[PDB]
């Protein structure tokens, strides 16, 4: 528990992380925001979702660490996907547990690209995954 009084987001999320196994990595732009209020950390993921909406943040848990960015650091990507169905690629991300429902792949089965917008660490993964998968399927 924690009563914040104009504390930097970095200090705040460090406080949240005390009761977590994973470190929290707060971007430069997120860290310059301040936060005030009475906080209880009885449900960190729910809090993260709410604060991301209140304060204009985006976040990703990659299974080992939590990344927090300002909404202004959102990466907007267009990604080629020529040799695999969008649905196959989606399921692949999901099964692997890297997919984040807050940052969905936006495409259609007619065209050879899809869009994705979200935390840089996430989008970088999505782009790499699509690039690896497209190549490995580039054949009869």
Author numbering: 34 to 173
Tell me, in the authors' exact words, what the paper reports.
The bacterial injectisome, or type III secretion system (T3SS), is a specialized syringe-shaped protein-export system utilized by many pathogenic Gram-negative bacteria for the injection of virulence proteins (effectors) into host cells. The injectisome can be divided into three major regions: the inner- (IM) and outer-membrane (OM) spanning basal body with associated export apparatus and ATPase components, an extracellular needle, and a terminating pore inserted into the host cell membrane called the translocon.
Superposition of the InvG and EscC crystal structures revealed a similar organization, with the N0 and N1 domains common to the secretin family; however, the relative orientation of these domains is shifted 36 degrees between the two proteins. Collectively, the crystallographic packing interfaces we observe support and mirror the low energy interfaces generated in our modelled basal body. This would be consistent with a model whereby the soluble domains have low-affinity interaction surfaces for oligomerization, which can be captured by the high concentration in the crystallization experiment. Finally, for InvG we observed a loop (residues 95–99) forming a series of side-chain contacts with the adjacent subunit. Furthermore, we observed a positively charged interior collar of the InvG ring corresponding to the N0 domain, where residues are proposed to be in contact with the inner rod and socket. This surface is formed by a set of basic residues lying on one side of the InvG monomer.
